Ligand code: HEM
Ligand code: HEM
Ligand SMILES: [Zn+2]
């Protein structure tokens with residue numbers, strides 16, 4: 001008979017999104033800084049710190065019955081205090097792979113004792129990813145795409161291979177132009193990178209684009225105005241959790257990218 005009441009502290013924005021997508025959001029009592037979806041619900045919840053800089057006291061003072069996160073959660077010394085306090089904790093992998101959404105969904109569903117709801121969500125996410133990949137197969141002339149991580153004019157980084165964004169670009173039928181500059185993971189933007197990449201599409205984050213003054217500011221960054229992207233103002237700005245979370249909205253984000261890439265394939269050059 002007896003029913004306990006679950007008090008979940010979720011350590012990562014993408015895990016939080018998945019708890020809410022499974023229908024269990026009312027049991028979440030604490031979230032990290034990156035947990036911006038669904039924004040109306042997560043803005044109301046106590047903050048336990050950023051996912052990689054978690055407060056042990058911020059988590060434990062919420063008296064959780066369960067703490068759940070994935071490999072981005074840290075530091076290790078905070079996880080260790082959770083264990084030493086005797087609070088149930090589980091952590092899952094989060095590889096840069098189109099299999100990560102399904103794996104994280106099954107992980108959360110099992111912890112919450114709803115494996116059937118989890119199979120239903122994973123099957124839908126996989127169907128949405130399938131549909132975007134089918135649209136991406138229409139691209140026979142794939143555009144060169146450069147992802148820029150921006151944090152004002154001071155910080156300008158490009159993402160190469162072994163990143164979630166690299167996986168998203170390729171599955172949406174685009175070419176990650178950071179390979180042409182040799183880039184693995186995150187590396188600084190440079191005159192040399194821009195010459196070698198000459199992207200057709202500039203892919204950025206919402207906040208990043210705001211932090212440089214919008215499209216007008218971005219194209220004041222040396223070299224960018226004169227790329228094929230810069231010339232046609234072909235800038236795609238997406239929310240960070242949406243583009244890079246590898247969560248339930250992965251198929252929706254792939255569809256937005258591939259639609260944009262298809263247009264660039266037709267219109268960027270000559
Ligand atoms: C692609 C993955 C990443 C995303 C989505 C991301 C996102 C963010 C966001 C949303 C902020 C706060 C808003 C702002 O800066 O205006 C931020 C700040 C920051 N990011 Fe990142 N970032 C990423 C990767 C990195 C990496 C790899 C580093 C370090 C090597 C880094 C270092 C920082 C620092 C130092 C701040 C400023 C913290 C503060 O001022 O309080 N970021 N980032
Ligand atoms: C969905 C993807 C991501 C989102 C939404 C996100 C969000 C944010 C936010 C809001 C901050 C500011 C936190 C603060 O200043 O206290 C931040 C900082 C940071 N992020 Fe991320 N992040 C993401 C992925 C990543 C990745 C992939 C890395 C590294 C590979 C990374 C490493 C960092 C680092 C080093 C900071 C500076 C804060 C610290 O050192 O504790 N993040 N992120
Ligand atoms: Zn339980």
Ligand SMILES: [Zn+2]
Pocket residue numbers: 012014015070071072094245
């Ligand atoms: Zn994650």
Ligand SMILES: [Zn+2]
Pocket residue numbers: 144175177180
């Ligand atoms: Zn190339």
Ligand SMILES: [Zn+2]
Pocket residue numbers: 252255256
């Ligand atoms: Zn859409």
